[PDB]
């Protein structure tokens, strides 16, 4: 469907991970990648 | 960790619990509080007369 | 409210509603409401300069 | 009557345990 | 972490006057001054302004940049 | 009036800049990778193989580089300690020595060889944390305030304890219950502990050893060493005639014994002695190195060694008769060890072990050889050194069968609570003796530690005294040479022992030299020799770190000069007169004449234990005397770190000092600079610190003010309705509303997932849509397209988070997804996904929960006083007094005396005038304000003087007779909530084995009821309770039974008669039979006989 | 009911009062050390003069 | 107890009729006396007496 | 061999 976006923690690029590649970063060497937050509707309380 | 006095003295119960204690000056001498998530847990069998 | 820096963003929707001060503190319609009872100095004997 | 020591004849059972809470933070079931 | 908005034991909003105490410790002032001209009264929301730490600016430090 | 200095507080910071508080743990191991990983180089440097005299092997030098990890494929990058504690790796350097092999003919030096790795510190100078400034620190994602010293191994922070042991190389003189007895152990730089003692019974002397079979006298051991005429013998003991006639049955026994001559000895100690080469010769390598191993021999001359065991029947004899005995729990022998040693003898035993390892793999291919020309670097490995020692730091069992020693729990995991029981974890020294309620000793507090090890700062429970915390002045001294001593002892004039005879050492004008447990030789004029020793030691060409004592019941001096010794810095006194004066002190706060060059100009110097046992010390300038010999520089600093944070401390009691410094650390608050980056295991956090009003100068030392842990709240001390019981205290649901002790907790849920040997792999599934909507399922609902839960969501009660399934052996999988358990519902926070050492993927969540106060709190006022919540009070309530403040937190007054607590009042009030004011008050231990000139400005705004209001209750609306104590005071928030201590279990999961409820909490079991509780139920007389709730609700079964012969049948039939007539049914539970059943391999049969209940 | 730190504190003729009770103290205990020195303190139990 | 960081624990009686034997021997009314000496042991707190 | 991204259909 679509690619799965993910942000590092260095450069933090928008990239994708396509199928059992090396997770890495394509534009800095760091290895550890983050997640983006989603895009539903949270309900929350102000009491 | 023995069968003797691990096992056949302590055989630990259910239906139970523990809780930290509070004052409450409202209620008799022979009374207790429990509260509604632990009531909800615990039960009590009967069998039905008339 | 809150601080930002590049790269960040904040919306939200809030809902204002009508309530009294006895469920929350936040419907405090008033800081402070307080009174005071009025004094009184009485004096005896005549008081001297110093 | 041979001259013993009541600690290491005698095990430690559930009384000499001393029930105390202290901050210590940081099998097959069918 | 931030200034609170309002008291804790009265409920006065102490929250709009972080900024201006800041600005008031720079201008030659004393803190017992500052804090008297500023509009605080009492004890109550004084101690809001007086004793408080301020850690989000150390934690913007660390927060994720964009480049 | 006298003279007064009050500049020497500013002392203390410029001596904790250079070492101190956590600094000498990276001390101990700067040095340790400097000088002790060469010292074990020198070691061992030669081997040499047995088939042929042509090959060996040769080192040249070894040293350690910068903290690096090897990827994928010959990519050496500079790690990060955040990168290894969020990807679960170690932080360690490889090791580069270079080595020399002679291979073929001709030598082959190959330079830069790889052995192994070695974890490094975190604040080490290797390391790259280190003399950066905070813009860069906050670059590589770590606190710049974090005091570090821990170790980082599989992506969790390990701290060593320091551990207290006995010095080694001294003679001890105990009482037992027979009488008085000697001993000495000795341990050398070579591996062999030995242990000697010379036991006193019906007035006659005998030695006792490890390898000895029986005792032998010591006049045959004498005659052995080499000293033949017995006259000399009685003259080295003592030329008194109460020893000699103490002495008489030992002469008259080795005169019975046909034992005149050398060798007549040396067969009868060889025929005494058993070892599993004639007698002569073991018996006479027995008494060279073997049983006293710190006295050197040049060739065969026992004249030391018999020296020794002269003075050590001299001491054993003075002890006797008298009521003088030496006790262990002087801390001015105790030694201390670091993480250093420890690391010394690992390093030392696995360097060997793999010189010894490779020497016997290349020993049997030279001979069955195919080829004319052996390499040693294809047969070598560099995975057993660095298993090893990742192995030993982990699990922490030390375990060295070189050294013949197995220790366990010496590293522990680094709590990070709150950074006050992060940096008390450095400070806490364990002792080697084991919970022991018969000891009572060394747990009591001693009068020998004066200022090094803090009296207040103990656990309360089952460890009352062992575990202590070091004080805020505090060195421990590193080893040294004796060279440079010696040769400036001889040149005092010092006389050799081999000079004089026995009839002198007996003299009393005669003193004898002892040197870290070795007789240096006679001196006369002791006090010249200790006072041209000192001046020495104030000029500076012998190191500061040399202590020199002296003892007249003895009559000799002593000269340590080992390790591990404690040492604070103290002003020297000039016969009336401090040396530091203002001018001296207006040049330091100037930013010239450091600590350096204040010991450099002989201004202050270092003691110990038992070098300030023979001087006096002054407490101020007014009680300094003539008789004074060094000054206390602040009096304050006897107090420990967890005891810096209590408000008048002498106020206080020592019970409720004690009980504070132990909820120091259990209060929860700010960790650090980056607590969201860095995922823990259980992480706690508060919603709005607040800054202690009245603060101490140790917590402007420490810099507490920048991340406290606690809220200032106004108190009313007075009673209420009905919830002021001794400890409970009651809340304002207003402030609680408007945010008074919010609280987070964070938790964390890691998954690894990897390969395996065949091509079996792992997969996610991920969402699971349904058929008539577009939508998830319930089960995986948080669950996103990828196969992971999103960030920022909420997770309730039995829900997926991460998808995982495993083959079973086209394979079948299994599915195993992780479910979160728990009662609220958390919200989370990130997801990091990574890769890890082994080429697994390791998968990492932080879940959130916000949490608010309730009833069934523990709070704590810094006062050692603590207390569960009460009623939450509402606004309607808590009367005002005049303006309109409404008490946060009512205190109860019932409890004041009871605790005897009178710095809590003085706090309270400090405070209320610090607010009122606008300064912060100073409140330190032995100082501070007094209440005098704080009482006179609470006038000048207009309040009452002392502590006195009008108040006005608010539930009748009547003025209150009495008036009420308000102030503010700073409150804490511990652990142990309600919400987690509160489980409940009725019918769940049970043991396999037998059939009962399981132990714990999180896996849904139950409660024991042991006899402690079955006691009180027999004293009653109630039976049918306490066999329905130990046998109808813990285990119920039917077993079948035969009245003739008693055993286990089935369906009611025996097969031992073979008959169905005699069969009958009871009720038994599962324990018993599980017994019976047990009881059978034994070569044991229960055989029961069942009786008729009826008739 | 309350308490506060104006119920604990010193008198004025309190302050007095107990300074000349340790002075005395104070004299009496300094002899006994040079009576013991010089040879006093006639014992009536069997017991050491320290 | 202590009511400070005190963890008190209780028990559901399952058959009904134990439950009338800790009725009447277990009983808060019954049990006021102590078997060691005979003193009334539940009097009251010190906040009732003060 | 990794498989990710599977939706299954019921
Ligand atoms: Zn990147
Ligand atoms: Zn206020
Ligand atoms: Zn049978």
């Not at chain 6, 420490?702 to 009651?730: C, H, R, W």
């Given at each position: 469907?679509?690619?799965m976006?993910?942000?590092?923690?260095?450069?933090?690029?928008e990239?994708?991970?396509?199928s059992?590649?090396?997770?890495?970063?394509?534009?800095?060497?760091?290895?550890?990648?983050?997640?983006?937050?989603?895009?539903?509707?949270?309900?929350?309380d102000?009491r | 960790?023995?069968?003797?006095?691990?096992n056949?003295?302590?055989?630990?119960?259910?239906?139970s619990?523990?809780?930290?204690?509070?004052?409450?000056?409202?209620?008799?001498?022979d009374?207790?509080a429990?509260?509604?998530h632990?009531?909800?847990?615990?039960?009590?069998?009967?069998?039905?007369?008339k | 409210?809150?601080?930002?820096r590049?790269?960040?963003e904040?919306?939200?929707?809030?809902?204002?509603?009508?309530?009294?001060?006895?469920?929350?503190?936040?419907?405090?319609?008033?800081?402070?409401?307080?009174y005071?009872?009025?004094?009184?100095?009485?004096?005896?004997?005549?008081?001297?300069?110093? | 009557?041979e001259?013993?020591?009541?600690?290491?004849?005698?095990?430690?059972?559930?009384?000499?345990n001393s029930?105390?809470?202290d901050?210590?933070?940081?099998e097959?079931?069918? | 972490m931030?200034?609170?908005?309002?008291?804790?034991?009265?409920?006065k909003?102490?929250?709009?006057?972080?900024?201006?105490?800041?600005?008031l410790?720079?201008?030659?002032?004393?803190?017992?001054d500052?804090?008297?001209?500023?509009?605080?009264?009492?004890?109550?929301?004084?101690?809001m302004?007086?004793?408080?730490?301020d850690?989000?600016?150390?934690l913007?430090?660390?927060?994720?940049?964009?480049? | 009036?006298?003279?007064?200095?009050?500049?020497?507080?500013?002392?203390?910071?410029?001596?904790?800049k250079?070492k101190?508080?956590?600094?000498?743990?990276?001390?101990?191991?700067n040095?340790?990778?400097?000088?002790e990983?060469?010292?074990?180089?020198?070691?061992?440097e030669?081997?040499?193989?047995?088939?042929?005299?042509?090959?060996?092997?040769?080192y040249?030098?070894?040293?350690?580089?910068?903290?690096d990890?090897?990827?994928?494929?010959?990519?050496?990058?500079?790690?990060?300690?955040?990168?290894?504690?969020?990807?679960?790796?170690?932080?360690?350097?490889?090791?580069?020595?270079?080595?020399?092999?002679?291979?073929?003919?001709?030598?082959?030096?190959?330079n830069?060889?790889p052995?192994?790795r070695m974890?490094?510190?975190?604040?080490?100078?290797?390391?790259?944390?280190?003399?950066?400034?905070?813009?860069?620190?906050?670059?590589?994602?770590?606190?710049?305030?974090?005091?570090?010293?821990?170790?980082?191994?599989?992506?969790?922070?390990?701290?060593?304890?320091?551990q207290?042991?006995?010095?080694?190389?001294?003679?001890?003189?105990?009482?037992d219950?027979?009488g008085?007895?000697?001993?000495?152990?000795?341990?050398?730089?070579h591996?062999?502990?030995?242990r000697?003692?010379?036991?006193?019974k019906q007035?006659?002397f005998?030695?006792?050893?490890?390898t000895?079979?029986e005792?032998?006298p010591?006049?045959?051991?004498?005659?052995?060493?080499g000293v033949?005429?017995?006259?000399?013998?009685?003259?080295?003991?003592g030329?008194?005639?109460?020893?000699?006639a103490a002495?008489?049955?030992?002469?008259?026994?080795?005169?019975?014994?046909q034992i005149?001559?050398?060798?007549?000895?040396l067969?009868?100690?060889?025929?005494?002695?058993?070892?599993?080469?004639?007698k002569?010769?073991?018996?006479?390598?027995?008494?060279?190195?073997?049983?006293?191993?710190?006295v050197?021999?040049?060739?065969?001359?026992?004249?030391?060694?018999?020296?020794?065991t002269?003075?050590?029947?001299?001491?054993?004899?003075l002890?006797?008769?008298?009521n003088?005995?030496?006790?262990?729990?002087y801390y001015?022998?105790?030694?201390?060890?670091?993480?250093?040693?420890?690391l010394?003898?690992?390093?030392?035993?696995?360097?060997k072990?793999?010189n010894?390892?490779?020497?016997?793999?290349?020993?049997?291919?030279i001979?069955?050889?195919?080829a004319?020309?052996?390499?040693?670097?294809?047969?070598?490995?560099?995975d057993?050194?660095?298993?090893?020692?990742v192995?030993?730091?982990?699990?922490?069992?030390?375990?060295?069968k070189?050294?013949?020693?197995?220790?366990?729990?010496?590293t522990?995991?680094?709590?990070?609570?709150?950074?006050?029981?992060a940096?008390?974890?450095?400070?806490?020294?364990?002792?080697?003796?084991?919970?022991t309620?018969?000891?009572?000793?060394?747990?009591?507090?001693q009068?020998?530690q004066?200022?090094?090890?803090c009296?207040?700062?103990?656990?309360?429970?089952?460890?009352c005294?062992?575990?202590?915390?070091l004080?805020?002045?505090?060195?421990?001294?590193?080893?040294?040479?004796?060279?440079?001593?010696?040769?400036?002892?001889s040149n005092?004039?010092?006389?050799?022992?081999?000079?004089?005879?026995?009839?002198?050492?007996?003299?009393?004008?005669?003193?004898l030299?002892?040197?870290?447990?070795?007789?240096?030789?006679?001196?006369?004029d002791?006090?010249?020799l200790?006072?041209?020793?000192?001046?020495?030691?104030?000029?500076?060409?012998?190191?500061?770190?040399?202590?020199?004592?002296?003892?007249?019941?003895?009559?000799?001096?002593?000269?340590?000069?080992?390790?591990?010794?404690?040492?604070?810095?103290?002003?020297?006194?000039?016969?009336?007169?401090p040396?530091?004066?203002?001018?001296?002190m207006?040049?330091?706060?100037?930013?010239?004449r450091n600590?350096?060059?204040?010991?450099?100009?002989?201004?202050?110097?270092?003691?110990?234990v038992?070098?300030?046992?023979?001087?006096?010390?002054?407490?101020?300038?007014?009680?300094?005397?003539?008789?004074?010999t060094?000054?206390?520089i602040?009096?304050?600093?006897?107090?420990?770190?967890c005891?810096?944070?209590?408000?008048?401390?002498?106020?206080?009691?020592?019970?409720?000092?004690?009980?504070?410094?132990?909820?120091?650390?259990?209060?929860?608050g700010?960790?650090?600079?980056?607590?969201?980056?860095?995922?823990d295991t259980?992480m706690?956090?508060?919603?709005?610190?607040?800054?202690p009003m009245?603060?101490?100068?140790?917590?402007?030392?420490?810099?507490?003010?920048?991340?406290?842990?606690?809220?200032?709240?106004?108190?009313?001390?007075?009673?209420?309705?009905?919830?002021?019981?001794?400890?409970?205290?009651?809340?304002?649901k207003?402030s609680?509303?408007?945010?008074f002790?919010?609280?987070?907790?964070?938790?964390?849920?890691?998954?690894?997932?990897k390969?395996?040997?065949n091509?079996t792999?792992?997969?996610?599934?991920?969402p699971?849509?349904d058929?008539?909507?577009?939508?998830?399922?319930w089960?995986?609902?948080?669950?996103?397209?990828?196969?992971?839960?999103?960030?920022?969501?909420?997770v309730?009660?039995?829900?997926?988070?991460?998808?995982k399934?495993?083959?079973?052996v086209?394979?079948?999988?299994k599915?195993?997804?992780?479910?979160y358990?728990?009662?609220?519902?958390?919200?989370?926070?990130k997801?990091?996904?990574?890769?890890?050492?082994?080429?697994?993927?390791?998968?990492?969540?932080?879940?959130?929960?916000?949490?608010?106060?309730?009833?069934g709190?523990?709070?704590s006022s810094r006062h050692?006083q603590?207390?569960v919540?009460?009623?939450?009070?509402?606004?309607?309530?808590?009367?005002?007094?005049?303006?309109g403040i409404?008490?946060?937190?009512?205190?109860?007054?019932?409890?004041?005396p009871?605790?005897?607590?009178?710095?809590?009042?003085?706090?309270?009030?400090?405070?209320?005038?610090?607010?009122?004011?606008?300064?912060?008050?100073?409140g330190?231990?032995?100082?501070?304000?007094?209440?005098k000139?704080?009482?006179?400005?609470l006038?000048?705004?207009?309040?009452?003087?002392?502590?006195?209001?009008?108040?006005?209750?608010?539930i009748?609306?009547?003025?209150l007779?009495?008036?009420?104590?308000?102030?503010?005071?700073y409150?804490?928030?511990?652990?142990?909530?309600?919400?987690?201590?509160?489980?409940?279990?009725?019918?769940?999961?049970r043991?396999?084995?037998?059939?009962?409820?399981?132990?714990?909490?999180?896996?849904?079991?139950?409660?024991?009821?042991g006899?402690?509780?079955?006691?009180?139920?027999?004293?009653?007389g109630?039976?049918?309770?306490?066999?329905?709730?130990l046998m109808?609700?813990s285990?119920?079964?039917?077993?079948?039974?035969?009245?003739?012969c008693?055993?286990?049948?089935?369906?009611?039939?025996?097969?031992?008669?073979?008959s169905?007539?005699?069969?009958?049914?009871?009720?038994?539970?599962?324990?018993?039979?599980?017994?019976?059943?047990?009881l059978?391999?034994?070569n044991?049969?229960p055989?029961?006989?069942?009786?008729?209940?009826?008739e | 009911?309350?308490?506060?730190?104006?119920?604990?504190?010193?008198?004025?003729?309190?302050?007095?009062?107990?300074?000349?009770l340790?002075?005395?103290?104070?004299?009496?205990?300094?002899?006994?050390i040079?009576?013991?020195?010089?040879?006093?303190?006639?014992?009536?139990?069997?017991?050491?003069?320290? | 107890?202590?009511?400070?960081?005190?963890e008190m624990?209780?028990?559901?009686?399952?058959?009904?009729?134990?439950?009338?034997?800790?009725?009447?021997?277990?009983?808060?009314?019954?049990?006021?006396?102590?078997?060691?000496?005979?003193?009334?042991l539940?009097?009251a707190?010190?906040?009732?007496?003060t | 061999?990794?498989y990710?991204?599977?939706?299954?259909?019921?």
């Open positions: 469907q679509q690619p976006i993910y942000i590092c923690g260095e450069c933090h690029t990239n994708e991970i396509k059992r590649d090396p997770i890495r970063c394509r534009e800095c060497g760091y290895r550890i990648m983050y997640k983006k937050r989603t895009k539903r509707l949270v309900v929350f102000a | 960790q023995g069968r003797f006095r691990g056949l003295s302590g055989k630990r119960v259910d239906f619990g523990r809780t930290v204690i509070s004052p409450d000056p409202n209620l008799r001498i009374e207790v429990v509260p509604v632990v009531a909800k847990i615990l039960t009590f069998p009967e069998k039905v007369n | 409210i809150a601080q930002l590049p790269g960040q904040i919306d939200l929707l809030m809902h204002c509603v009508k309530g009294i001060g006895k469920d929350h503190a936040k419907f405090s319609p008033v800081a402070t409401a307080s005071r009872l009025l004094p009184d100095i009485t004096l005896l004997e005549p008081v001297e300069g110093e | 009557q001259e013993y020591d009541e600690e290491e004849q005698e095990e430690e059972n559930d009384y000499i029930y105390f809470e901050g210590d933070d940081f097959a079931t069918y | 931030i200034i609170p908005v309002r008291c804790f034991t009265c409920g909003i102490v929250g709009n006057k972080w900024e201006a105490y800041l600005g410790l720079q201008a030659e002032y004393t803190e017992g500052a804090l008297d001209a500023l509009g605080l009264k009492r004890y109550c929301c004084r101690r302004l007086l004793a408080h730490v850690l989000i600016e150390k913007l430090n660390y927060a994720p940049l964009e480049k | 009036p006298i003279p007064t200095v009050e500049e020497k507080w500013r002392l203390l910071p410029a001596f904790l250079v101190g508080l956590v600094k000498q743990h990276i001390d101990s191991f040095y340790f990778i400097n000088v990983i060469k010292k074990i180089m020198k070691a061992n030669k081997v040499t193989s047995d088939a042929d005299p042509m090959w060996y092997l040769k040249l030098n070894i040293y350690v580089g910068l903290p990890v090897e990827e994928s494929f010959n990519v050496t990058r500079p790690v990060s300690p955040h990168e290894c504690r969020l990807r679960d790796m170690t932080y360690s350097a490889p090791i580069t020595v270079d080595i020399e092999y002679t291979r073929g003919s001709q030598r082959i030096i190959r830069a060889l052995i192994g974890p490094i510190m975190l604040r080490s100078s290797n390391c790259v944390l280190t003399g950066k400034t905070p813009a860069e620190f906050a670059k590589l994602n770590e606190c710049p305030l974090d005091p570090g010293g821990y170790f980082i191994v599989k992506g969790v922070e390990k701290v060593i304890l320091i207290e042991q006995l010095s080694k190389n001294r003679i001890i003189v105990e009482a219950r027979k008085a007895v000697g001993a000495s152990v000795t341990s050398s730089t591996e062999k502990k030995s000697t003692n010379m036991a006193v007035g006659r005998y030695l006792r050893h490890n000895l079979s005792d032998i010591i006049v045959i051991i004498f005659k052995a060493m033949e005429s017995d006259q000399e013998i009685v003259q080295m003991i030329t008194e005639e109460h020893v000699m002495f008489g049955p030992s002469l008259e026994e080795c005169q019975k014994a005149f001559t050398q060798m007549q000895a067969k009868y100690i060889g025929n005494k002695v058993r070892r599993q080469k004639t002569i010769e073991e018996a006479r390598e027995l008494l060279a190195s073997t049983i006293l191993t710190h050197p021999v040049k060739e065969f001359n026992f004249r030391a060694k018999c020296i020794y002269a003075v050590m029947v001299r001491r054993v004899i002890a006797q008769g008298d003088k005995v030496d006790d262990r729990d001015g022998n105790k030694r201390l060890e670091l993480a250093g040693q420890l010394s003898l690992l390093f030392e035993d696995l360097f072990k793999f010894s390892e490779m020497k016997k793999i290349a020993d049997q291919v001979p069955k050889q195919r004319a020309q052996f390499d040693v670097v294809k047969h070598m490995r560099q057993q050194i660095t298993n090893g020692m192995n030993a730091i982990s699990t922490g069992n030390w375990s060295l070189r050294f013949k020693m197995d220790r366990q729990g010496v522990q995991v680094l709590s990070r609570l709150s950074y006050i029981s940096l008390g974890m450095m400070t806490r020294i364990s002792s080697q003796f084991e919970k309620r018969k000891v009572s000793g060394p747990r009591s507090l009068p020998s004066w200022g090094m090890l009296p207040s700062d103990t656990p309360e429970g089952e460890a005294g062992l575990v202590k915390n004080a805020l002045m505090t060195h421990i001294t590193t080893d040294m040479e004796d060279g440079p001593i010696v040769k400036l002892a005092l004039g010092v006389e050799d022992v081999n000079l004089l005879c026995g009839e002198e050492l007996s003299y009393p004008n005669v003193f030299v002892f040197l870290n447990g070795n007789i240096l030789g006679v001196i006369r002791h006090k010249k200790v006072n041209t020793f000192r001046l020495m030691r104030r000029a500076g060409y012998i190191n500061e770190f040399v202590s020199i004592s002296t003892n007249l019941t003895d009559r000799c001096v002593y000269i340590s000069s080992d390790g591990g010794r404690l040492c604070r810095p103290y002003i020297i006194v000039k016969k009336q007169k040396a530091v004066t203002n001018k001296h207006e040049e330091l706060a100037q930013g010239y600590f350096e060059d204040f010991l450099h100009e002989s201004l202050v110097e270092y003691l110990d038992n070098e300030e046992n023979d001087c006096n010390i002054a407490l101020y300038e007014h009680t300094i005397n003539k008789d004074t060094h000054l206390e602040e009096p304050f600093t006897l107090l420990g770190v005891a810096g944070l209590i408000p008048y401390p002498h106020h206080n009691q020592s019970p409720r000092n004690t009980y504070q410094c132990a909820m120091g650390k259990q209060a929860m700010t960790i650090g600079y980056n607590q969201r980056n860095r995922i259980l706690y956090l508060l919603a709005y610190p607040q800054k009245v603060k101490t100068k140790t917590i402007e030392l420490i810099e507490f003010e920048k991340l406290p842990a606690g809220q200032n709240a106004t108190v009313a001390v007075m009673s209420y309705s009905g919830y002021d019981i001794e400890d409970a205290l009651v809340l304002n207003a609680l509303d408007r945010g002790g919010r609280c987070l907790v964070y938790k964390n849920a890691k998954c690894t997932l390969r395996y040997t091509q792999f792992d997969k996610v599934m991920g699971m849509l058929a008539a909507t577009r939508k998830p399922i089960r995986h609902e948080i669950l996103d397209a990828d196969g992971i839960c999103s960030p920022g969501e909420k309730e009660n039995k829900q997926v988070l991460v998808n399934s495993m083959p079973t086209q394979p079948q999988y599915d195993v997804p992780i479910t358990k728990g009662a609220t519902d958390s919200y989370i926070e997801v990091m996904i990574s890769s890890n050492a082994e080429d697994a993927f390791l998968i990492k969540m932080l879940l959130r929960q916000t949490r608010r106060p309730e009833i709190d523990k709070f050692g603590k207390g919540c009460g009623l939450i009070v509402p606004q309607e309530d808590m009367p005002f007094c005049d303006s409404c008490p946060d937190i009512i205190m109860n007054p019932h409890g004041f009871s605790r005897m607590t009178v710095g809590k009042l003085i706090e309270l009030l400090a405070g209320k005038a610090g607010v009122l004011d606008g300064r912060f008050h100073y330190t231990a032995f100082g501070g304000s007094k209440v000139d704080v009482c006179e400005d006038v000048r705004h207009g309040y009452n003087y002392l502590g006195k209001d009008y108040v006005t209750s608010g009748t609306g009547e003025p007779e009495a008036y009420i104590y308000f102030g503010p005071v409150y804490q928030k511990l652990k142990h909530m309600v919400l987690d201590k509160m489980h409940a279990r009725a019918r769940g999961p043991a396999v084995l037998t059939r009962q409820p399981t132990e714990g909490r999180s896996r849904d079991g139950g409660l024991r009821l006899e402690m509780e079955r006691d009180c139920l027999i004293g009653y109630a039976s049918m309770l306490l066999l329905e709730r109808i609700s285990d119920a079964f039917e077993v079948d039974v035969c009245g003739q008693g055993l286990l049948g089935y369906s009611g039939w025996c097969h031992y008669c073979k169905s007539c005699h069969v009958s049914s009871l009720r038994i539970p599962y324990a018993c039979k599980l017994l019976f059943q047990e059978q391999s034994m044991i049969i055989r029961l006989k069942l009786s008729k209940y009826n | 009911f309350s308490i506060g730190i104006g119920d604990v504190t010193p008198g004025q003729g309190l302050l007095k009062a107990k300074y000349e340790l002075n005395a103290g104070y004299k009496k205990c300094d002899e006994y040079e009576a013991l020195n010089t040879g006093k303190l006639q014992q009536q139990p069997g017991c050491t003069a320290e | 107890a202590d009511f400070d960081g005190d624990n209780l028990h559901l009686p399952q058959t009904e009729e134990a439950k009338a034997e800790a009725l009447v021997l277990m009983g808060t009314k019954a049990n006021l006396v102590t078997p060691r000496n005979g003193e009334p539940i009097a707190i010190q906040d009732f007496l | 061999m990794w990710l991204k599977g939706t299954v259909q019921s």
